[PDB]
Write an enzyme that holds these catalytic residues in place. Structure first.
Site, PDB file in Angstrom:
ATOM      1  N   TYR A   1       0.830  -1.190   0.000  1.00 35.47           N
ATOM      2  CA  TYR A   1       0.000   0.000   0.000  1.00 35.47           C
ATOM      3  C   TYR A   1       0.866   1.241   0.000  1.00 35.47           C
ATOM      4  CZ  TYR A   1      -0.974  -3.274   3.815  1.00 35.47           C
ATOM      5  OH  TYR A   1      -0.944  -4.331   4.679  1.00 35.47           O
TER       6      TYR A   1
ATOM      7  N   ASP B   1       0.492   4.472   1.422  1.00 33.28           N
ATOM      8  CA  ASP B   1      -0.347   5.184   2.380  1.00 33.28           C
ATOM      9  C   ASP B   1      -0.625   6.610   1.910  1.00 33.28           C
ATOM     10  OD1 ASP B   1      -1.111   3.371   4.424  1.00 33.28           O
ATOM     11  OD2 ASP B   1       1.006   3.229   4.981  1.00 33.28           O
TER      12      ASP B   1
ATOM     13  N   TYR C   1      -4.222   6.240   0.041  1.00 40.17           N
ATOM     14  CA  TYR C   1      -5.136   6.466   1.158  1.00 40.17           C
ATOM     15  C   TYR C   1      -5.217   7.908   1.631  1.00 40.17           C
ATOM     16  CZ  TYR C   1      -5.676   1.429   1.730  1.00 40.17           C
ATOM     17  OH  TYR C   1      -5.975   0.108   1.556  1.00 40.17           O
TER      18      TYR C   1
ATOM     19  N   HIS D   1       8.452  -6.960   5.630  1.00 39.23           N
ATOM     20  CA  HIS D   1       7.981  -5.852   4.801  1.00 39.23           C
ATOM     21  C   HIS D   1       8.961  -4.693   4.947  1.00 39.23           C
ATOM     22  CE1 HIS D   1       6.442  -5.252   8.838  1.00 39.23           C
ATOM     23  NE2 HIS D   1       6.507  -3.956   8.585  1.00 39.23           N
TER      24      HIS D   1
ATOM     25  N   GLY E   1      -5.441   2.276   9.404  1.00 36.00           N
ATOM     26  CA  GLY E   1      -5.586   0.882   9.774  1.00 36.00           C
ATOM     27  C   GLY E   1      -4.717   0.503  10.958  1.00 36.00           C
TER      28      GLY E   1
ATOM     29  N   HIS F   1      11.746  -4.146   7.801  1.00 29.98           N
ATOM     30  CA  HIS F   1      11.203  -4.554   9.092  1.00 29.98           C
ATOM     31  C   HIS F   1      11.074  -6.076   9.119  1.00 29.98           C
ATOM     32  CE1 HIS F   1       7.862  -3.934  12.389  1.00 29.98           C
ATOM     33  NE2 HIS F   1       8.942  -4.534  12.857  1.00 29.98           N
TER      34      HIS F   1
ATOM     35  N   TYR G   1      -1.421   0.675  11.223  1.00 30.84           N
ATOM     36  CA  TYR G   1      -0.194   1.464  11.279  1.00 30.84           C
ATOM     37  C   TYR G   1      -0.398   2.864  11.787  1.00 30.84           C
ATOM     38  CZ  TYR G   1       0.635  -1.842   7.513  1.00 30.84           C
ATOM     39  OH  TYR G   1       0.737  -2.995   6.769  1.00 30.84           O
TER      40      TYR G   1
HETATM   41  N1  LIG Z   1      -2.276   1.177   5.452  1.00 35.56           N
HETATM   42  C1  LIG Z   1      -3.332   0.969   4.480  1.00 35.56           C
HETATM   43  C2  LIG Z   1      -3.787  -0.488   4.524  1.00 35.56           C
HETATM   44  C3  LIG Z   1      -4.894  -0.719   5.558  1.00 35.56           C
HETATM   45  C4  LIG Z   1      -6.031   0.080   5.579  1.00 35.56           C
HETATM   46  C5  LIG Z   1      -7.030  -0.156   6.521  1.00 35.56           C
HETATM   47  C6  LIG Z   1      -6.896  -1.199   7.439  1.00 35.56           C
HETATM   48  C7  LIG Z   1      -5.755  -1.994   7.421  1.00 35.56           C
HETATM   49  C8  LIG Z   1      -4.758  -1.755   6.481  1.00 35.56           C
HETATM   50 CU   LIG Z   2       6.863  -2.491   9.896  1.00 36.93          CU
END
Ligand SMILES: [NH3+]CCc1ccccc1
Ligand SMILES: [Cu+2]
Ligand SMILES: [NH3+]CCc1ccccc1
Ligand SMILES: [Cu+2]
Ligand code: NA
Ligand code: NA
Lengths: 620, 620
Positions: free
Chosen positions: A288, A290, A294, A423, A372, A584, A374
């Protein structure tokens, strides 16, 4: 008055009205991105024109649009329909987070998978993950999210402790069909909870920590004017905020005597990517962006005084647009404060008898975002001595899976039956440079080892070499820690009192770059992440290292397409793009909630000043 | 009661008496090193025997001696005469600093050199520099210092701004002869002053800095017992002090539940070297081992509350011996305090609604030392989450020369006519490891890239590989930043709840190691500095990476001689030696007094705990 001021709630409301009146904000429309455009090169007209860029999604299946709007002239400047099979899908919408779980909850294939595992559908959370581009031809031109399931035992349970492995579904969120459900086998759902506020798990809390009180009895040393203009200890800058990038720094300058000297025109984290290294078909598609997919700014936290930011804190509360064009405040979204930073300079001289000590400090501008599992803190630091530093702080909960019986080369075990795939977290800093003005160049500096021999008879000499990057085709550079490689951004037309070009040196952490195979989909979509340093010629439309529409784009957009223009960058208006990241391998100590780990970079003056710029600092 | 307690003034006085009575402290004797010996392996007898090691110099030209003394039994344990042509000269004495200038001041060759430059001998300061070993056969077995001259215009002038280049002298400080005076040409003495407290140079001081107040209203969270035993936030350790090494950390342990778990038995900076990269015959011999040749602990500063250490400070005042065996206090030589360290862990969960934030802090133990123009701060940090970090802070005044007309490949220009030769600052950390006990091993961990293909069809997989170092002959390792190389110290006989060996991971900064030609004198004398990581089997007498007598030793002693024993290090009592350093190309901003630059390393838990060790931290 300043063209770099934060967007106001009133400006957002005008944008919504302008869009509505023009027919572009019907009940099936959703704003997927809204942001103010930077002033174009040549703001010396003072004809302020506040323009906004909008991405408009259509939930009924019509083509989305990109729209530019002038709030200064109440006009739609342009409005273009987008072919998303060509140029990429729009960023994920927040209201689509729950749609994946809801659509799966009535799918027969999904329910048979859950029933075989004795899982109550009302307990199963589904993560809405970006889809990328892989082998599925049916996905081109459709808006796809993929779903991985986690079990919540009760409403306040941490679902991350209970991944449902061997199961993944793909969902079309516009037509509301589940396109595939893949079940590769049953894995035990890991049973231990990861509830880090449960006294059963924490034990009795410590009573040994005594308070640390940080106060400024006469207030802070910096001033804020016009809402977002900062002056602090000869530094000057504007703090901006964009829903995609987050905190953006404009017009970084340093007052050297009577002269205001520019250093950086615009600094941002323009992209970040998290690729996973697990080859299992359940997760091998997982990457992803981010930032690009997102939008990290829209998930910024409200920061709590005493917990998130400690000391004498000044807050900024940026305004963004919701999906319908209404303004929403992010209360206390940006913290600003100064911090003591130890000794700045110290010497006790044997011959003069003078004892000299000065203390350092830094200005901190920070925000935190949550996407999410993170959580990421973004920190910009300005130091008394001219150093600029960025630091990313990564925490939150690691993304989990089952730990396979008989182990794994690509997953760490965190708890019985519970794994965490390998990752990376890779960032791209975009530094639109302005070292003493816009005529800049980049040199690569390597240490040079010398052989013992004539002119070096004791074999002690060593040197350094600088290579000017003159064209974009030669400005894609790799790190070399072994030769102490750094990059200097200088202005060949501005000299210090020694008649040498003024400059700033970029110090990288030299962490590994993208590990994926160069022929992979992620290496094509995140091409920026394969090299440590890129330099381009400034151009208004070249904003992101991955291009404007990252979601489900097939690759190549952004930096690799920019540098193919092979433009002149030797004493021109240039932009430096620095890739840096963390690799990581999750450890037991990362579970059930991760202690912060950090990565970043810094820039230090390199003959920019005529002597140390902190001679005028007083003695505490 | 503790065998690791600091030496007391009374213990020093007894040592002096014991030496005097035995005839070993006549009026021609000088103590060049005095220090307490660590308890031998097998302290479970509780038969405390406080022993001291003494190096005794003779100013009349007799052979020096190494002497061990038991203050517990008022006895000389052993006393050996030293052949310094063989095993090296004793460390430089503080009273020899001025002897070089005084002997040169009456030498006819020296006075002719100064007269040709119109320099008044009473204005000329002479730096007492260690000599090394080069081509001069007459120097073997004699105590030689070399001298470089700087002009002081007036008593409070910074002499470093006025180097006298093209001139160097060698002096025998025992027989008091000037053995050579080399004049290679006249250089203009740079004229600008570097007086960083002169209002002419600083300008008006800033009035914009407002105070930062750091206080602990209920006192600090750590306790000190027995003079130097620290307990803080589950950490336990003893803070020692040695006149050669400075602050030494003993018995670092972490209380995990009811169990006190060892991590490091002894941590110190066991050597540091500053090699210069200027091939001019005036300076091409210049390398000093601040630790081994000069003894950094005896030049520790008295640290001022509010200026050097800020906050709620606890001081230690270590006691050392002067050249005659009298005790001298270094008042306030070690600062200890805790510091807020930002966010420790943070997560806002979309599904459970729980918002969680904890703050981090660190324990700081620091001292500062000054050797001539250079000032160094040594900082040890202990963090809540189990991380241990060392940081060196380098400041003071750069070592200067003339800047040659027509430039230089090995010297930076700082001011008109004033140069600063290229050099490195390289440290050796000696980490006597005790991860959960003394059975430890080192693995080298590299990231492993994988090719797209069967089993990795999307080309996203990556992995890691660990190589056990089993014998000393294979335990000399280089960094590889590109493959993310780290080293894990584990205990194969102590497992976490996942049945994996407990461990700690060493994260290096991956800065360049020694740049000199491998055939040079400095590469032979500072062999440790050519590689990033060495592992040896513990042995009582293997204390320093360069051997016991660094001054004028011809090379090879220390680490290269230790590892030739090729001992077993796979699950044994081992010692890790980490080389790290700064490569310093001086910049204009380093002049006339240098802002701090830093280098260091850190160790983080790697499956040492069964879950995050900071779950029991409370909410501020
Ligand atoms: N970091 C974006 C991926 C994500 C988005 C929402 C929930 C879990 C993972
Ligand atoms: Cu990590
Ligand atoms: N750092 C040890 C070298 C040194 C010692 C004294 C004065 C100047 C330089
Ligand atoms: Cu230096
Ligand atoms: Na630019
Ligand atoms: Na050991």
């Amino acid at each position: 008055a300043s063209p770099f001021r934060l967007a106001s709630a009133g400006e957002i409301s005008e944008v919504q009205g302008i869009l509505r009146t023009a027919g572009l904000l019907g009940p099936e429309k959703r704003i997927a991105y809204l942001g103010v455009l930077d002033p174009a090169r040549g703001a010396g007209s003072e004809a302020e024109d506040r323009r906004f860029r909008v991405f408009i999604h259509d939930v009924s299946g019509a083509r989305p649009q990109e729209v530019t709007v002038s709030v200064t002239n109440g006009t739609v400047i342009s409005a273009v329909e987008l072919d998303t099979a060509a140029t990429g899908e729009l960023p994920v919408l927040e209201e689509e987070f729950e749609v994946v779980e809801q659509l799966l909850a009535t799918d027969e294939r999904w329910l048979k998978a859950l029933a075989a595992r004795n899982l109550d559908v009302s307990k199963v959370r589904v993560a809405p993950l970006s889809a990328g581009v892989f082998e599925y031809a049916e996905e081109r031109g459709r808006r796809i999210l993929r779903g991985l399931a986690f079990v919540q035992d009760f409403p306040e349970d941490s679902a991350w402790a209970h991944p449902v492995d061997g199961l993944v579904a793909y969902v079309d969120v516009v037509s509301k069909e589940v396109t595939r459900v893949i079940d590769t086998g049953v894995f035990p759902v890991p049973a231990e909870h990861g509830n880090y506020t449960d006294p059963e798990l924490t034990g009795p809390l410590r009573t040994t920590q005594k308070p640390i009180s940080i106060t400024q009895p006469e207030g802070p040393s910096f001033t804020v004017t016009g809402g977002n203009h900062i002056e602090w200890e000869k530094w000057s800058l504007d703090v901006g905020f964009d829903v995609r990038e987050g905190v953006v720094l404009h017009n970084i300058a340093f007052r050297d005597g009577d002269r205001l000297r520019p250093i950086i025109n615009r600094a941002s984290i323009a992209e970040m990517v998290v690729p996973y290294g697990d080859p299992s078909p359940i997760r091998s598609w997982q990457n992803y962006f981010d930032t690009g997919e997102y939008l990290v700014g829209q998930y910024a936290n409200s920061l709590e005084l005493g917990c998130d930011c400690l000391g004498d804190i000044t807050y900024l509360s940026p305004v963004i647009s919701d999906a319908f064009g209404n303004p929403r405040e992010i209360r206390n979204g940006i913290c600003m404060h100064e911090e003591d930073w130890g000794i700045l300079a110290k010497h006790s001289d044997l011959w003069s008898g003078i004892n000299y000590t000065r203390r350092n400090r830094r200005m901190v501008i920070s925000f935190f975002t949550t996407i999410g599992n993170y959580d990421y803190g973004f920190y910009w630091y300005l130091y008394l001595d001219g150093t600029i530093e960025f630091e990313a702080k990564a925490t939150g909960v690691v993304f989990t899976s089952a730990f396979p019986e008989g182990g794994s080369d690509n997953i760490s075990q965190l708890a019985p039956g519970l794994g965490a795939p390998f990752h990376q977290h890779i960032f791209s800093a975009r530094l639109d440079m302005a070292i003493d003005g816009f005529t800049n160049r980049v040199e690569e500096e390597d240490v040079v080892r010398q052989t013992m021999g004539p002119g070096n008879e004791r074999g002690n000499a060593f040197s350094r070499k600088r290579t000017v990057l003159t064209r974009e085709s030669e400005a894609v550079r790799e790190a070399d820690a072994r030769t102490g490689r750094t990059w200097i951004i200088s202005n060949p037309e501005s000299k210090n009192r020694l008649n040498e070009p003024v400059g700033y040196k970029l110090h990288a952490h030299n962490q590994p770059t993208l590990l994926a195979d160069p022929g992979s989909s992620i290496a094509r979509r995140a091409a920026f992440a394969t090299k440590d340093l890129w330099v381009t010629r400034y151009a208004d439309d070249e904003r992101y290292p991955t291009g404007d529409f990252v979601n489900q784009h097939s690759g190549g957009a952004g930096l690799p397409s920019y540098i193919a223009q092979d433009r002149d960058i030797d004493g021109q208006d240039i932009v430096v793009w620095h890739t840096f990241g963390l690799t990581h391998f999750p450890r037991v100590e990362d579970w059930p909630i991760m202690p912060v780990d950090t990565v970043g970079f810094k820039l230090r003056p390199e003959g920019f000043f005529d002597r140390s710029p902190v001679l005028d600092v007083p003695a505490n």
